Amino acid sequence: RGIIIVFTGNGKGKTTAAFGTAARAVGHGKNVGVVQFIKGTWPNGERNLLEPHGVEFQVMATGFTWETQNREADTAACMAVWQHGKRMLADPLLDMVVLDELTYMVAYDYLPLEEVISALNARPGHQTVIITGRGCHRDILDLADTVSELRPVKHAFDAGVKAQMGIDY
Amino acid sequence: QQRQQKVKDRVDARVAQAQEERGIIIVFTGNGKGKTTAAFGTAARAVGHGKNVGVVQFIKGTWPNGERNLLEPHGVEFQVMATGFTWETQNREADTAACMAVWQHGKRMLADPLLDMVVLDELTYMVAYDYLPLEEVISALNARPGHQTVIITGRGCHRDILDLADTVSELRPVKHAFDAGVKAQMGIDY
Numbered sequence A: 001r002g003i004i005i006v007f008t009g010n011g012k013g014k015t016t017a018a019f020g021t022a023a024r025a026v027g028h029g030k031n032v033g034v035v036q037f038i039k040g041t042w043p044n045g046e047r048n049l050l051e052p053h054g055v056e057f058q059v060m061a062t063g064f065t066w067e068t069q070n071r072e073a074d075t076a077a078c079m080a081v082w083q084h085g086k087r088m089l090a091d092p093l094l095d096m097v098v099l100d101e102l103t104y105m106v107a108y109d110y111l112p113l114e115e116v117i118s119a120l121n122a123r124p125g126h127q128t129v130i131i132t133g134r135g136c137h138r139d140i141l142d143l144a145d146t147v148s149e150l151r152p153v154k155h156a157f158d159a160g161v162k163a164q165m166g167i168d169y
Numbered sequence B: 001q002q003r004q005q006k007v008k009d010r011v012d013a014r015v016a017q018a019q020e021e022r023g024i025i026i027v028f029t030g031n032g033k034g035k036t037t038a039a040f041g042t043a044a045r046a047v048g049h050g051k052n053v054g055v056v057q058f059i060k061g062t063w064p065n066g067e068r069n070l071l072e073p074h075g076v077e078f079q080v081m082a083t084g085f086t087w088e089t090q091n092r093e094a095d096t097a098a099c100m101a102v103w104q105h106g107k108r109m110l111a112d113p114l115l116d117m118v119v120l121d122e123l124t125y126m127v128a129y130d131y132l133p134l135e136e137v138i139s140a141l142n143a144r145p146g147h148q149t150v151i152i153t154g155r156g157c158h159r160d161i162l163d164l165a166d167t168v169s170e171l172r173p174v175k176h177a178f179d180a181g182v183k184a185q186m187g188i189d190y
C-alpha cells in the first residue's frame, strides 16, 4: 500500500526529505523514479549519488523563464517533463516516485491540476509518491495521506550564511 | 515594469550580503514525519559532491537501516545505538551507559576536520531524558571544525540547542497516514 506524501512549507528540507526517503527506499532494495520540475544551476548531488544505484531521473529542460509572455514555451517544457511523470506513476515496478517541486507547476497553471490528480489516483496500489514544494494545491493536500509543514523557525541565510555545496545544493 | 527590477535588486542585494561561509547547525524538529529523512537527504546530497559525512543514531530501530545500507559503502560511518535500550527509569544506568557510548563516537566525528558533515540522529531525546548532558553537546558543537556542519534531529529539542542552531525547521504534521490507519512500511517509515 503506497501513500501520498507531501513536503511543503517555507523552511529548508522538503527536497532533502524526499531524497532521504528515496535513499532509504533504495537502501531497502526498492525501485524509485524521480522527476524534478526545476532546473538547478549547480550539479545535482542527489542525482550524482542515486542515479548510479538505479534511480531514474528526469529533469526539467534548461532555461525555464517563469515569465508570463513565455508561458507557452515554459509550459511545453513542463508538459514535457510531466510525461515521464505520467510514465512513472503508471510503472508497476516502481515502488516510489519523487515529484520534485510540482507545487509551483500546478500553482502557476503550467501543469493542469486534474492531470496530476488523475495520474495520482490511477497509480499502482503499492506505489508511494512524494511531492514537494512551496504552496501545494488544496486539492493535492487533501488527496494526500501524509503531509508535513517545514516551519521556518530559523534559517542560516538570514544570519548572512552563503548557500554552499553539500548543504544547499 | 520597474517592480521586476525592484525584486531583482532585492535578491541581488540579499545574496550580495550573505557572503559568510562555514559549517552550520541544522535542526529538524516537530512531530511531523521527515526529521531523520531530511538529514539523510542532505547527507546524500553532500556525498553526491564528494563531501565527507559521519552519522550517529541515538535510537536503534526494529528493522534494517536502508540509509546505512546505501550510505555506509560510500564511506559514511555509522555509529548506532545498542539493542535493548530501556526507556525504564529503573534501568537508567544501563541505558545511560549505552548512550554515552554512542556519544563518544559523536564526540569523535565532531572533532574530526575531515568530516564536512555530522548527523546526530535522534539526539533530542537523549538530552531531554537526561541520558546525556547538554553542556557536553553544547561544547562539542562549540569546538567542531569551522567548516563542519551538524544536523540534529528529533522531537522536542532543547532550546539551548535550538538557540545555538543556525537553521531550524519544525515539521508540522498536517497529515499522517498512520492516524488514518496506515501501518508503518519499508523504504517509507523505516
Ligand code: B12
Residues within 6 Å of the ligand: A038, A039, A040, A041, A064, A066, A104, A134, A135, A157, A163, B007, B008, B010, B011, B012, B015
Ligand atoms: C522559494 C524561492 C523561489 C520560489 C518563489 C515563489 C514562492 N515562494 O512560492 C520560486 C520557485 C518561484 C523561485 C524560482 C526561482 N528561483 Co528562487 N528562491 C526561492 C527561495 C528559496 C526563497 C525566496 C523567498 O521566499 N524569500 C523571502 C521573501 C520574503 O523575500 P522576497 O525578496 O520577496 O522573495 C521573492 C524573490 O526571492 C522571488 N524569487 C524567487 N527566486 C528568485 C530568483 C530570482 C533570480 C529572482 C529575480 C526572483 C526570485 O520570489 C519571492 C517572492 O516574490 C530563495 C532562496 C534564497 N536564499 O533567497 C531562492 C532564490 C531567490 N531563487 C533562486 C533561483 C536561481 C531561482 C530560479 C532561477 C530557479 C530556477 N532554476 O529556475 C527561479 C526564478 C524566478 C525569478 N523570479 O526569477 C536563487 C537566485 C540566485 C541569484 N543570485 O539571483 C535563490 C537566491 C536561491 C539560490 N539558488 O541561491 N524561487
Ligand SMILES: Nc1ncnc2c1ncn2[C@@H]1O[C@H](COP(=O)(O)OP(=O)(O)OP(=O)(O)O)[C@@H](O)[C@H]1O
Residues within 6 Å of the ligand: A010, A011, A012, A013, A014, A015, A016, A017, A132, A133, A134, A150, A152, A155, A157, A163, A167, A168, A169
Ligand atoms: N527558508 C529558506 N531560506 C533560504 N534558502 C532556502 C530556504 N528553504 C530552502 N532554501 C534553499 O533554496 C533552494 C530551493 O529550496 P526549496 O525552496 O525548494 O526548499 P527545500 O526543498 O526545503 O530545500 P532543500 O532542498 O535544502 O531541502 C535550496 O538551495 C534550498 O536549500
Ligand SMILES: Nc1ncnc2c1ncn2[C@@H]1O[C@H](COP(=O)(O)OP(=O)(O)OP(=O)(O)O)[C@@H](O)[C@H]1O
Residues within 6 Å of the ligand: B031, B032, B033, B034, B035, B036, B037, B038, B122, B153, B154, B155, B173, B176, B178, B184, B188, B189, B190
Ligand atoms: N507523526 C508521526 N506519526 C506516525 N509515525 C511517525 C510520525 N513521525 C514520524 N513517524 C515514524 O516514526 C519513526 C521515527 O520517528 P521520528 O520521531 O524520528 O520522526 P522522523 O525523523 O521525522 O521520521 P522519518 O525517519 O520518517 O523521516 C519512523 O518510522 C517514522 O517514519
Ligand SMILES: [Mg+2]
Residues within 6 Å of the ligand: A014, A015, A016, A101, A132, A133
Ligand atoms: Mg526543494
Ligand SMILES: [Mg+2]
Residues within 6 Å of the ligand: B035, B036, B037, B122, B153, B154
Ligand atoms: Mg527520526
